[PDB]
Every structure is written in structure tokens, then in C-alpha cells.
Design a protein around this ligand. Sequence first.
Ligand SMILES: COc1cc(COc2cc(C)nc3ncnn23)nc(N2CCNCC2)n1
Lengths: 156, 39
Amino acid sequence: GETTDGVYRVMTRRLLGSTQVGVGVMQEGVFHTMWHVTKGAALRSGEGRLDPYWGDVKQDLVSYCGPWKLDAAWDGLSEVQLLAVPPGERAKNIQTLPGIFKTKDGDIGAVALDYPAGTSGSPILDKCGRVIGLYGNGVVIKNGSYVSAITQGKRE
Amino acid sequence: DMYIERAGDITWEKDAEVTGNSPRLDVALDESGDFSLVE
Ligand SMILES: COc1cc(COc2cc(C)nc3ncnn23)nc(N2CCNCC2)n1
């Protein structure tokens, strides 16, 4: 199948038409997305099959064909870019300064950017182009707007 | 059956659109992976 590095749409035909349930990242032969996008199910890449290899519902992450490869981290200081991939619309970079989720287990970056639900799993980048985490697990705040965590896994 | 379609190279774009605010929020993470606003 298509093993090429880059950002990919996740699509289903089980609803009406072809529907974008979310987004993902291919790197070093491994496909990375959020657990709530696939719920752990297998994926088709043309003739090709992708099988789930690692996942955790609490981190809300899943890898396919191999272990989690994305290890870069927000430095706590700089702007970043959401490589947003909205349903039926073209990829598109958005630059933002992250906010903070304060938790009982320590602090994580947050991106206050609003997109449809099927944008879930769109990658966040640092200035060198490295993926620091996935967009699309977070909270709805006062306004009615959405804030996502910068969700990142661990590389072995 | 779900399937994947390539949508872009992962690069930083100079003169991307710059927007969004940067809230500092207190949040809880449950066993199901749901974040919630703690106030
Ligand atoms: C792009 O990723 C996502 C994921 C989700 C997940 O769905 C919901 C629904 C509700 C009722 N409250 C929620 N609290 C946290 N997530 N969450 N929702 C959205 N959005 C964008 C803004 N409009 C629509 C909701 N985007």
C-alpha cells in the first residue's frame, strides 16, 4: 500500500457516502492516529491491510504495523503549527501559541483551534517540522469553542 | 472497513495563517480518556 511518510485522512463507508472519521500520520512505516478515530479496527491502504500494533484508550492513541515512532515534544515556549485536515477540505497549516492543561499528573500543551470532529488526529509540528503530538482530544470551554491537548506517545 | 488517503507532506509553512488564543486550564483525565473542566 501507501507507506509514504506524511498526513492521511481516515475514511469509512459504513455511514452515508464516504465520511472522514479522522486523521493520522505515517512515519518510518508506522501509522499513528487517535484511538477514538478507529476504535482499534484494521485499516485499508489500497490493496494493503494495516493491523493495530499498540494502543491505550486513556492516552487515546494507537499505532499500526509497528510501535509508536513520534518522540518530539513542545519546548513550552514557541509557536507551533496545526497541519489541520478538515473533512472535504485541503490540508492547511495554522500557527498558534499553545496554552496549558494543568493536571494532578503534570502540565501538557493545549491548542485553542476549532475544527469539525473528523479533523481529530491532525498533527502538531515544531519549527523543524517534527510531530510533537496529535490534535483532537480535549474539552469544550465557556464560549462554546474547543481546546485540544497536544497528545504525544512514548518511543521505545 | 475504514481506509486511508494521503492528504499532505508534514512541513512547516512560512506565512501560514496565525490565530487562536492560549488558555491556562485546570483539567481532569478519566479512565475512558475524556478530559473535563475542573473549576
Ligand atoms: C477535532 O476534534 C474534535 C473532537 C471532539 C469530540 O467530541 C466532543 C463532543 C462534546 C459534546 N464534548 C466534547 N468534549 C470534548 N470532545 N467533545 N469534538 C470536536 N468538536 C469541535 C468543535 N465543534 C464540535 C466539537 N472536535
